[PDB]
């Protein structure tokens, strides 16, 4: 990790160009520190990591900063140990990571890929004056609808889908539509999906979510929003599915 | 989840009790009409001691074709209610399929 | 364990006999190892046991092997501590045993003795070649019914029994009949409480479970199958229950 940081720091200190370092599994940079700190003579910390977990993690993460000569954008694929989202290794990296994105096994076991959590994944670039007012409002409405669905997960699972309101049922179906629409066919995940990938921009997903949660198109079947690039492709898949239903 | 479920089912218990009481209040609203109707009907049965050639709604002269009409409760989770109701309905339509009634 | 095991293996290797060794409380052996190795200076291990908790008890178990001269069928009443199966002292015994039957305290808190939990109880001899497709298929069907019951126990939680549809209601009635039938007055539990013991055979209990799963016994109540032997005696107990009202 420090080798990658040294190459990036050279390209940001001397070559004056904004570089994009991808570190995969930054949690290894802490676990290997654990395996050496055990033998080194340093006392064990909490659940089993090194004592200087936070200072070492900071010694990696702080050197990644836009420093008036360039900008080191970086995407560390932090590994949450068995989804212990309270463990020291992700708990120290949440403080350093600006636009964190918590991917969840819960939203992967039902097949919604990418397994990014709509709620937990949050960024300090979702401030309105920075991201755009309508985009911020759509993000707030999507997160609120998903939060309402996560709060109705207990009522739905036990007391039946029917035992709640008929406006809240519209919010549940809308949350289903949203949390399936935010699935994406990747170009590199075509070997897992079997279907080609669709790269979709920002304004297009905003225009899709506006029509999804504005109640204008709450008639399409739920599977018509699954693994779909854009809302127009979702409309086309609704026609495909309605033809395949009778055929 | 269990605590929120407990709060929700307590709320549904309270709302269901209030709904039971409001249905009882509708019945007590109806009881003037039913009392006046059940006394005027006797007044007619006393002025005329069932001296009648009328009322096609009194043709009990055979059991040719019964119309068992079954009202049931219409929501989710329905206590243990709807199954008992339609169970007795199925038993009764079986007994009416024995006699050969052609029940609607 | 070692000395009783040597006493048994001398008979299995020199006299060629089918000797049994009912080693009782394997866990007490491992816990004695825990004491001695906490005092022997050996460094501590998982939760409290010796570091050699998978080689010392290996020296116990692996010496119990049926040789080509004679065979030994040890019955080791290994004890899970604090009633959790994840513990290492029985977890290292699960890998060595082959017909493990977990006497979970649940069915004994319900009063069903023996409390052999039918889902956790499992054997490498539940194979087609060994028991025949008949007994294997009935074992699979009864484990199916009991597993469906245990997985909808989460609904026989907060809600009531009524909320099940007719499918789940029938499978719950059948599962209750089964998990009651799996009780038996032992021939040695005449002392505590109940009837004199009844010896129930394989080709006899297979009839009872075929009869229960075949649906031809829906008329019997639940306390009729409880603490009974064969299925004919279960029907007799139901009839006498109806006579005594």
Swiss-Prot record, chain A:
A GO cellular component entry from the record: proton-transporting ATP synthase complex
Signal peptide region: none
GO molecular function: ATP binding; ATP hydrolysis activity; proton-transporting ATP synthase activity, rotational mechanism
Disulfide bridge partners, by residue number: none
Localization of this protein: Plastid, Chloroplast thylakoid membrane
Domain of life: Eukaryota
Keywords: ATP synthesis, ATP-binding, CF(1), Chloroplast, Hydrogen ion transport, Ion transport, Membrane, Nucleotide-binding, Plastid, Thylakoid, Translocase, Transport
Keyword Nucleotidyltransferase: no
Biological process according to GO: proton motive force-driven mitochondrial ATP synthesis
Function of the molecule: Produces ATP from ADP in the presence of a proton gradient across the membrane. The catalytic sites are hosted primarily by the beta subunits.
Family: Belongs to the ATPase alpha/beta chains family.
Subunit structure, interactors included: F-type ATPases have 2 components, CF(1) - the catalytic core - and CF(0) - the membrane proton channel. CF(1) has five subunits: alpha(3), beta(3), gamma(1), delta(1), epsilon(1). CF(0) has four main subunits: a(1), b(1), b'(1) and c(9-12).
Name of the protein in its database record: ATP synthase subunit beta, chloroplastic
Lineage: Eukaryota, Viridiplantae, Streptophyta, Embryophyta, Tracheophyta
Residues of the full protein shown: 250 to 496 of 498
UniProtKB/Swiss-Prot annotation, chain B:
Protein function: Produces ATP from ADP in the presence of a proton gradient across the membrane. The gamma chain is believed to be important in regulating ATPase activity and the flow of protons through the CF(0) complex.
Whole sequence portion shown: 53 to 156 of 364
Active site positions: 78
Cell compartments where the protein resides: Plastid, Chloroplast thylakoid membrane
Name of the protein in question: ATP synthase gamma chain, chloroplastic
Originating species: Spinacia oleracea (Spinach)
Top-level taxon: Eukaryota
Additional notes on this entry: Alkylation of Cys-78 results in the inactivation of ATP synthesis.
Subunit structure, as described in the record: F-type ATPases have 2 components, CF(1) - the catalytic core - and CF(0) - the membrane proton channel. CF(1) has five subunits: alpha(3), beta(3), gamma(1), delta(1), epsilon(1). CF(0) has four main subunits: a, b, b' and c.
Gene: ATPC
Swiss-Prot record, chain C:
Name of the gene this protein is made from: atpB
Protein name, as recorded: ATP synthase subunit beta, chloroplastic
Subunit organization: F-type ATPases have 2 components, CF(1) - the catalytic core - and CF(0) - the membrane proton channel. CF(1) has five subunits: alpha(3), beta(3), gamma(1), delta(1), epsilon(1). CF(0) has four main subunits: a(1), b(1), b'(1) and c(9-12).
Subcellular location: Plastid, Chloroplast thylakoid membrane
Role played: Produces ATP from ADP in the presence of a proton gradient across the membrane. The catalytic sites are hosted primarily by the beta subunits.
Residues of the full protein shown: 250 to 494 of 498
The family this protein is said to belong to: Belongs to the ATPase alpha/beta chains family.
